[PDB]
Each structure stands twice: as C-alpha cells, then as structure tokens.
C-alpha cells in the first residue's frame, strides 16, 4: 500500500493506519495452521 504508516506505536497510529494494519495480522493468524500442516505433510513423507 503506497500509503505508509509514518507513526509508531509510541506516537499512536491513527484510525486508518490502525485499519490497514489488520489485514496482514489476520492473514497471519489464518495461515499459521496451513503452514503447520504443510510442514507436517513433508515430515510424514520423510518418515515413511
């Protein structure tokens, strides 16, 4: 997003800044089971 966040968590993000920073956060909390599953699949193979 070419609009950056020119504020820190010390100054305090504005409302929009705090809105466009939820996207990647939720992407992470979502992906962080598929990642585990892929690793486990590779490991299951390597073990078999």
């Amino acid at each position: 997003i070419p609009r950056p966040i020119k504020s820190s968590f010390r100054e305090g993000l504005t409302v929009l800044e705090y809105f466009i920073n939820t996207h990647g956060a939720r992407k992470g909390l979502a992906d962080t089971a598929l990642r585990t599953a892929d690793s486990g699949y590779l490991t299951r193979r390597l073990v078999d």
Binding site: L13, V15, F19, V47
Partner: protein, 1088 residues
C-alpha cells in the same frame, strides 16, 4: 453523561460526539419486532419510508394465502396474526424449566366457490417462543441467543477469470435467488456466448432468447453492437421458438418425450412462476439497482422477468467489450463493473427474525400439504378451517430451531460483556452458510467495507478466524439486511448535524472524511489536505469542498470489547484481538472494582447488557433489602424489583446482584439501582487495579509467567465464586422402578449424615469427592447414588426437585428429577491464568509473601511483578501507559498554572488541571491521553501521606528488596494496572490416571476428563521415542497400558505386590491377527 447516576469519570477527550451511541442490542429486538408487527416498529417504519408497513408473519401468511386445489371449488386463507399475553414471567420460566412463549392466533377463512359461503373461524396456531427485553430466548429453562448469519445477497453477480489454458480473460454472470434454479451465462475463449440452466450442459444463449419468443430480427436489433453475439446466432442449429424450447427440454429433461406445451410450461414454471422461483424482495432490489430497472418504483412483489434476463446479457457483452456504462431501453444509466463477493453491498445479514420466518415458512408448507391431502377427501358444506388444519409441523420447526440449530446458542453467561458480544455477533457459518472446506482465506479477510459495520479485530484465534465477527457500535441493519453506519453530512466544505446512515454501495460513490479532522466554531474545516477514504478501500489527501460526507467519531469501526481497551492505537492488532477475547473470558469476583483508568464505554455496556437494574420510573426509594427493592414513584405507583442472588450462569459463574441505593434516595429513570456480577456503580468492573513493577525478578517471571503478592489471597482480592449443577433422574425400568430414598444397601451409617429424610443431601453441608449428594437405586437392590466428581467440592447451595406427582413437568420414561447446586470459593493459586486488556497473559509462577516483594520508600509493597522482555517484541506498550496513568490517578495531580497553562496542557480541558486521589479517568481509544500530557501529569502527581513523591517524572521509583533489604541499583517503572482473572483455572484443567474405566468397545481407557481417561500417545511421540532408540517403553505404552487386558492386570498386580515386571510374551496384536489370515486360508508362518 446522559445517564442520571453517572460516577464522574474525567475524560481526556478533545472532541464532542454529535451522535450518542445507540442501544447496543437493538439489532435483535428491532428484528423480532418486525416479525410480530409490533406497533413500535409499525410507526418506526411509517415515520420514514413506506406507507403500508408489512410485518414478518403477515408476509409468510400472504405468500401462502390462498390455499387452493387444482379445481378451485374452495379456498382457505389465513390473516391477522395476534399475540395474547405470555403465560409466565422470565424468572418463573428459568425456574420451572419452561419456555417463555405466547399463544398465537390467526383468523382462518374458508369459502365454497360453488356456493360462496364464508366460514370464518379464529384458530390457535401454537405457543410461540417470545423474546426477553435483553435480546434472548428462554428454551426449556436455559437462556439462549439467536446469532445473526452473514450470507450473500440474492442478485446477479458478474466475474472475470483469466483463463488457464490460453491465458485469456473470460467473463461470467450468475443469477442466484432465495429459491429456484441457477441460470448462468458466459463468454468463453472461442468468443461465443453461452448459457447453462439448472447447471446443466451448456447451450448457446440464443436458444434461450428464441425460447422466449424472440425472432432473429429482434435480437439483431437489441444486440448487434457485438459480433460475438451475431456469431452465436449464426452458429446455431435451432431456429424457431418451439425448436429451441425442445432443445432446452431435451438437455434438461432426458427420456421424457418433448411436447410443445410441456416445454412452454417448463420454461414458464422454472423462472417466471413465483412458486418454484423467487428472487426475494432483496433479490429484486439488488437486480433493479444494478441494471438500472424499475427506477423510482415499488419492489412490492416480483420474480424473474424478461427485461432482466436480457439486460444481464447486454451487461455481460458490454463488459467483455470493456465499457463503463449501460442505459437499458427504459431503465436508467448504470456503471459497468465486476462485482466483489465479500463486499457488504453483496453480503447481507439474516437476523433472528428472518431465520424464524424461514422456519415458520417450512412448517407452513408442511401444513399446506397436509391440508390439501385432507382437503380433497372430506365432505364439503361441513369443513371449517380448524378441521383442515394440523399445526403440529409448525411447532416442530420452531422446536427444531431453538434446539438442533447451529445459530441458537447457549448464552455466554460468563460475564455481561460476553453475552453482549454474543448478541452482536455475526456468523458466516451455519445452516445456509458455509463450512471449513469453502471457508478459505478471502472470506476470512478484512475488507474496506467493514469500516463502521464489522470489527477488524474481534474474532476468535483458531479455526474460526475471520468467519465469526462482531458488529460495531454505531451500526444498524437495513430491513433488507444490509448494515448501515452513520455519517455526518457536509455541504460547501462545512459539516452539518444531519446524520445519514449509509450502506456500503452508497458509501462507495462519495468521499468520506475523518472525525479527528480540525474545525472551528462551525464544523468548517481549517486544513485543506483532508484525509479521506475513496471507493476501492483507498485513502488519500484531498481538498476541502471535495468531501461528500464525514465520520461521526474515531471509534466507528471498533466493537464493544475493543472499545473498552485504553491506549489501543499503541498496541498491535494481534494483541488487541487477544485482549478483547480475554475480557470476554473473565470470571466475576466476590467484589468488583472499576478501572482507575478506563474508557467512556463501561457504563453503557453495563446498562445495555442487562445484568444491572435500572429505574423504570423516576421516584423515591421506599424500601431496600438484598432480595427486594421498592420504589414508590412520583405518579403514585409502587414498583418492586427483585434481585438474583448467587444465580448459577451457564458457565458456573455467579450472577449475584447487590443494591447501591439507600432508602429515601430520589432516583431518576434510567438510573442504576443495583450492580451486577462485574459492575461497580454501573460500569464494567471485570478486574482489579494492582500495583505493578516492570522488572525481572529472580527468574520466576520467565517467559510470560508472573509473580503475585499474598495480599491478593489474604484479602481475597482475586477470589471468585463458582457454582456447579449435578442432576440425577429417577425413571422406570422392567426390573422395577427407581425410587429415590435415604436408605441404601450395605454402606456406612455416617455417609447418611448430610442426607435429609428424602435421601437428598442437606443444605449448608460441605461435601467432598466421592461423597453422596442424592440417593438413587435401580433394583436387583443396587446403590445408584449420585456422588461428587473428583476434584470439584464445596458447599450445597440449592436443591431443585421435580416430581411426576406434583405435575410440574418431566420428560418421557422419567418420573423424578433432582438438581443440586454446590459452590466453591476459589482464591488465586499458582497455575491460574491472569491477563490485561492489551494481550498480556501468563500463569502464576510464585505467590510471594508481602515481606519479600519489592517495596517502596513508603513501605508500600507492590502487588504484581511483570517482566520487561515480553513488552517490546509484542508491541503491547499500551499497558505501560496504562500503568503510568494508573499511578497518576491513584495519586492525584495538580498542574501549577500560576504563570499559565504550560505548553503541554494546551489541548487539555479545564477539568483535568487537577484531581484528588482515587480519581478514575477516561482515555477513549482514538481520542485519549496523548504522551506529552501523560509525561507532564507524571510530574504533578500529588505527594503522599508524608510529603514525598514515591515515583519520578518518568514513571520510575527506586525500590527495595524484601529479601536482602538492599535497594535495587536502578529505578523501576511502577504503577497501577487493571488485570483480569480468566476462566482458565487449575482444578478445571488438571488430570491424572493410573488405572480406571476402560471403553469396552475398543479395550482402551475412556479418554476424557469426564470419563477419567488418560492421555494419548500419537504417531509423533512414537517417532520421537523410536529416535531415542527407546523400545521397551514404547512397547510398554502400546501394549501394557492401552489395549492389552491380561497385561494391565498382571502389571498392576506385579507392582502392588513387589515382584519384577513380567516380560513380553508374543505380541497379542499378532496372536489373533494370525487367526484372521489362517481363516482366509493364507498359510502365514513365522520362522527363524
């Protein structure tokens, strides 16, 4: 304020809220009102909108009336639904294990078209589960909540999908009603338009057009702006309507012979007959807004017509050809544009009302059938409607939705906020929704259409991430089902006070400003590069007269648990998410205390939820006890409120209420008369303010663990009450009848100490695992008594006993029922979980005596020690600021304005210039305490009892070690933080097993905390163990401990006797498998 009894809670807010937060659970009540045509809703509609306000029952009964047969000699209609008073109150229901319902009535008229004789007859439709003032239902005694479902709106949805084989663009459309068949058009790589009906084999759309009575001249007139369409015309082996109707009937009804009339009536009663196909009213709205049809004109009732099936194609072509406009012949201009699926213009909300409507419709369809089938085989001139009618199906639908549905959920009664967020919850899963297969990662995303409509933070952390959500605070719900949020209106660069609620599509064709934008004395603007959001979720600098709207507050997108977080813009979304979902799991304490530093959002949450008691009418407190409050009002009437004492929730908590008013007091209306489980003077108190030191102690606060004083146990600060329910039924049996009594086969004579004459334990008696609560028997005779499960213990509160004889109510096969309610006061031990409102939790490692805690130069010990290592890599510093302000409050302040307000109190009100101790304050999430103000107020910080300031102007206080007595060489950040005790306790999460109950279907332990089952030993553990080379322990786990039977016996014996453990024989998973291959005549042999 706007609340009569308003504990003064000063605010650092620098703006004025031009719009008071609405009722927070209206999303439920308004919808249930639309369903029963209540007069409030009827006028609310008439007051703005339409002229005939049609309800939600009226609507089904109209879309059902009249029930005719094939001939029409007779007809049977329903109308004018009525709701006569409820039988019993909410308490009477929650106690008698009964539902909160009202008799429903509807007039049923019958005609005899041969004669024409009316036989009007009022009817009894059933007892209809009604809805409480709190936004709930009460089903069979338990309190429930009908969550709202997110779905995709009916309509016509275009698309574009780069092709795979050829890397070619190719468009598609799709018409999706509430009921009917899916009609899809496409443009493929061969550049030939096509169609599919009931998702069947594909066809040239020209087939459909001609089937609709179109001649190639008509087509060439309408189309012809596109050569692909002319080509689909030429390259077609079916000319003439009837030939095309036969084509459709063939690719759609194979084996049955084509008949002219059959095909005509098929294409008629597939889309255009409003019995097998209906775009619900929202569907028609969406399909007219798009396509520019039926402009400025009713949407009363309709289904698919021809103009829409044709403008769909014109839109598809005009879009393939890459255009930005379409002006249908008669319709209006419209932008050509692909449709986003997760956009809220396209997604919509089924509220409790619509769900119940649908299930009532289902029951009514069953009733309609059953009516017909007894409407041919009866004697006319005799049949009233109450003969043709069997209401049973209806009730079942009702009783099958308020039970056996994934949207009627047991209420989250762990604390007021948990329920309040349960009721404002949006689900994208359930009957009619989706599942974890289709549920990918774009429905679980945040979309720029959620601003003011859905919270981008509140949602679970695991497999329900992004699907479940929570509705914002300033948002409401269109009658269609689309969520609206308010915006201030702006004219000529200056902002008015006219509030206009917008749904997304409207929001998208405007330039929307930001609340924190400056103004001066008028709402006018003083900057020029105003920050705005544009259509495509985009944000940018723009001019002044160029804004078409404005936001009311900064907290328009946040929710009700995320707005009770101070210093949010200083935390990160993950940790704020976790804080929110933590507050929502927080037990009620024996004594509640409100945040010394909070947000202007706890009072209103506590009111709207409903675990408090508010003055119905202004008046004067006549009498006050702990079980009753009595107000003699100003009009002469005497209201009498009753209080729930030690009331078990659905989660073991306590719902005790306690008054906060004294006799003779004069209360307004809207004033809090009693507090709840987690309120103090009407504002959420889910936790405690505790004196915290930010420092690493001697390794006992390592990796997120925490350290506590023992004053939090001595003074039962973080102590909770937990109640639990134990039920036993006494039913009949062949061998005999179960009779609950005191006497029992040979057992002790003391165990019957706490048992009264009836065999049920005696109140005020303390109990212990294995001890008896109530005595039941199955003949032989047997000892079938109820005993406390392992761990749980406490004192007998209550006994709720139901008997066949007394005739209260019971199920089938059962004759008697006893519920026991036993309580447990739980002080904060080690292993328990704590947290704060910023995503900072941790188990308790060490509970330290007060004399070894880091104490201050006042003698004041700290109460909790938190480590420095988890703060700066998690971005949850909002707790540091919280801590500082907590100090600033517990120890008041006075800015010295002798020479004038300093350069950092400029923006401050004239009410924060000073404050005494214990001075609660408010730092709203995005209009709150800045950092200069806080650094300055850390210096004022009135001295103590002895004229000394224990804390510097940086938040740091020199401390002393209670073990060495020597001071720590470096000053330490100290303050007061608001923390919370979580349902994740110890006793309810601890387990252990040596040998107990096994399955008897698999030869394994009955795996479960309730069945006293052991832990599992999966594949990965076996892998690790094999990688150690450990081979006798692995065999010990897989044979001696789980499945083997003689092995378990012999090992228990060998250990209880003291003889070395026997050695394996030959695997018993082999001594029998053999005896299966010797059965298939396989000569499996084992050899050396």
């Amino acid at each position: 304020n706007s609340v009569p009894g308003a504990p003064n809670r000063v605010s650092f807010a620098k703006l004025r809220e031009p719009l008071e937060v609405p009722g927070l659970l209206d999303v439920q009540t308004d919808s249930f009102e639309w369903l029963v045509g209540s007069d409030r809703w009827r006028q609310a509609a008439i007051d703005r909108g339409e002229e005939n306000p049609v309800g939600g029952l009226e609507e089904v009964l109209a879309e059902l009336s009249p029930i005719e047969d094939f001939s029409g000699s007779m007809s049977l209609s329903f109308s004018d639904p009525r709701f006569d008073e409820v039988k019993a109150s909410v308490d009477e229901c929650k106690d008698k294990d009964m539902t909160y319902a009202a008799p429903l009535f509807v007039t049923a008229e019958f005609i005899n078209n041969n004669t024409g004789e009316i036989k009007s007859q009022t009817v009894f439709m059933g007892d209809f589960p009604m809805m409480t003032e709190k936004g709930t239902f009460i089903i069979n005694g338990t309190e429930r909540v009908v969550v709202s479902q997110l779905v995709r709106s009916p309509g016509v949805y275009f698309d574009e999908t780069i092709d795979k084989s050829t890397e070619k663009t190719l468009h598609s459309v799709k018409v999706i009603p509430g009921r009917g068949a899916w009609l899809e058009f496409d443009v493929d790589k061969r550049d030939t338009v096509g169609v599919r009906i009931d998702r069947k084999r594909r066809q040239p759309v020209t087939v459909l057009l001609k089937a609709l009575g179109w001649t190639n001249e008509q087509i060439v007139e309408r189309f012809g702006f596109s050569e692909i369409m002319m080509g689909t015309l030429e390259k077609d082996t079916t000319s003439g309507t009837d030939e095309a109707l036969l084509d459709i009937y063939r690719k759609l009804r194979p084996g049955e012979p084509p008949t002219k009339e059959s095909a005509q009536t098929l294409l008629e009663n597939l889309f255009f007959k409003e019995k097998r196909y209906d775009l619900a009213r929202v569907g028609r709205y969406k399909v007219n807004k798009k396509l520019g049809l039926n402009a400025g004109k009713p949407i009363t009732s309709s289904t698919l017509t021809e103009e829409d099936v044709v403008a769909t194609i014109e839109y598809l072509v005009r879009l393939h050809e890459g255009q930005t406009s379409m002006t249908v012949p008669g319709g209006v201009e419209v932008p050509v544009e692909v449709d986003d699926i997760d956009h809220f213009g396209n997604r919509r909300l089924r509220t409790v009302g619509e769900l119940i409507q649908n299930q009532i419709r289902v029951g009514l369809s069953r009733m309609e059938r059953v009516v017909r089938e007894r409407m041919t085989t009866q004697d006319v001139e005799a049949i009233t409607p109450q003969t043709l009618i069997n209401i049973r199906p209806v009730v079942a639908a009702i009783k099958e939705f308020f039970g056996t549905s994934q949207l009627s959920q047991f209420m989250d009664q762990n604390n007021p906020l948990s329920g309040l967020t349960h009721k404002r919850r949006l689900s994208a899963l359930g009957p009619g929704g989706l599942s974890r297969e289709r549920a990918g990662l774009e429905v679980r995303d945040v979309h720029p259409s959620h601003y003011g409509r859905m919270c981008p933070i509140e949602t679970p952390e695991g497999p329900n991430i992004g699907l479940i959500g929570s509705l914002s605070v300033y948002a409401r719900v269109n009658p269609f089902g689309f969520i609206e949020t308010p915006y201030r209106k702006v004219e000529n660069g200056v902002v008015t006070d006219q509030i206009d609620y917008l749904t997304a599509d409207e929001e998208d064709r405007h330039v929307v400003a930001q609340a924190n934008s400056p103004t001066d004395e008028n709402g006018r603007f003083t900057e020029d590069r105003v920050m705005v959001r544009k259509k495509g979720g985009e944000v940018e600098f723009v001019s002044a007269d160029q804004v078409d709207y404005m936001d009311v507050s900064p907290r328009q997108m946040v929710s009700v648990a995320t707005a009770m977080i101070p210093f949010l813009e200083h935390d990160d979304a993950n940790r704020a998410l976790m804080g929110a979902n933590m507050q929502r799991q927080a037990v009620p304490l024996v004594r509640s205390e409100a945040p010394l530093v909070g947000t202007g959002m706890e009072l209103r949450a506590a009111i709207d939820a409903g675990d408090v008691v508010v003055a119905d009418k202004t008046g004067v407190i006549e009498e006050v006890s702990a079980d009753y409050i009595t107000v003699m009002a100003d009009d002469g009437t005497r209201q009498s409120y009753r209080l729930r004492k030690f009331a078990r929730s659905n989660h073991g908590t306590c719902a005790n209420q306690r008054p906060i008013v004294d006799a003779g007091q004069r209360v307004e209306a809207g004033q809090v008369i009693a507090d709840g489980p987690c309120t103090q003077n009407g504002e959420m108190a889910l936790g405690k303010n505790l004196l915290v030191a930010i420092m690493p102690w001697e390794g006992h606060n390592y990796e997120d663990a925490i350290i506590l004083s023992n004053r939090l146990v001595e003074e039962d600060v973080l102590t909770s009450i937990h109640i639990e329910e134990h039920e036993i039924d006494a039913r009949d049996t062949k061998l005999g009848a179960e009779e609950i009594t005191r006497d029992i086969p040979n057992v002790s004579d003391e165990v019957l100490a706490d048992l009264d004459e009836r065999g049920i334990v005696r109140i005020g008696a303390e109990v212990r695992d294995g001890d008896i609560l109530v005595g039941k028997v199955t003949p032989k005779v047997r000892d079938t008594s109820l005993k406390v499960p392992h761990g749980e213990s406490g004192k007998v509160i209550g006994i709720r006993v139901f008997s066949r004889e007394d005739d209260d109510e019971l199920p089938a096969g059962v004759n008697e029922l006893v519920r026991v309610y036993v309580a447990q006061k739980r002080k904060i031990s080690d292993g328990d979980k704590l947290a704060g409102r910023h995503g900072n939790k941790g188990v308790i490692g060490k509970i330290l005596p007060v004399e070894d805690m880091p104490f201050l130069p006042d003698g004041t010990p700290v109460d909790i020690i938190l480590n420095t290592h988890g703060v700066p890599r998690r971005m949850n510093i909002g707790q540091i600021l919280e801590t500082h302000l907590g100090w600033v409050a517990k120890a008041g302040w006075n800015i010295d304005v002798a020479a004038g307000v300093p350069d950092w109190a400029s923006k401050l009100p004239e009410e924060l210039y000073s404050a005494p101790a214990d001075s609660t304050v408010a730092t709203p999430v995005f209009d709150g305490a800045q950092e200069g103000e806080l650094a300055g107020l850390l210096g004022s910080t009135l001295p103590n009892r002895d004229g000394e300031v224990m804390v510097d102007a940086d938040g740091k206080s020199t401390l002393f070690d209670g073990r060495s007595g020597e001071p720590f060489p470096y000053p330490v950040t100290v303050g007061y933080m608001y923390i919370l005790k979580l349902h994740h306790l110890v006793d309810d999460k601890i387990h252990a097993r040596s040998t107990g109950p096994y399955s008897m279907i698999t030869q394994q332990p009955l795996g479960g905390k309730a069945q006293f089952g052991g832990q599992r030993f999966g594949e990965m553990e076996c892998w690790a163990m094999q990688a150690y080379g450990a081979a006798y322990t692995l065999q010990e786990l897989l044979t001696i401990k789980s499945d083997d039977t003689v092995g378990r016996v012999k090992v228990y014996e060998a250990i209880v006797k003291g003889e070395n453990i026997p050695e394996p024989g030959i695997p018993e998973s082999f001594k029998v498998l053999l005896k299966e291959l010797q059965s298939l005549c396989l000569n499996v042999e084992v050899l050396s």
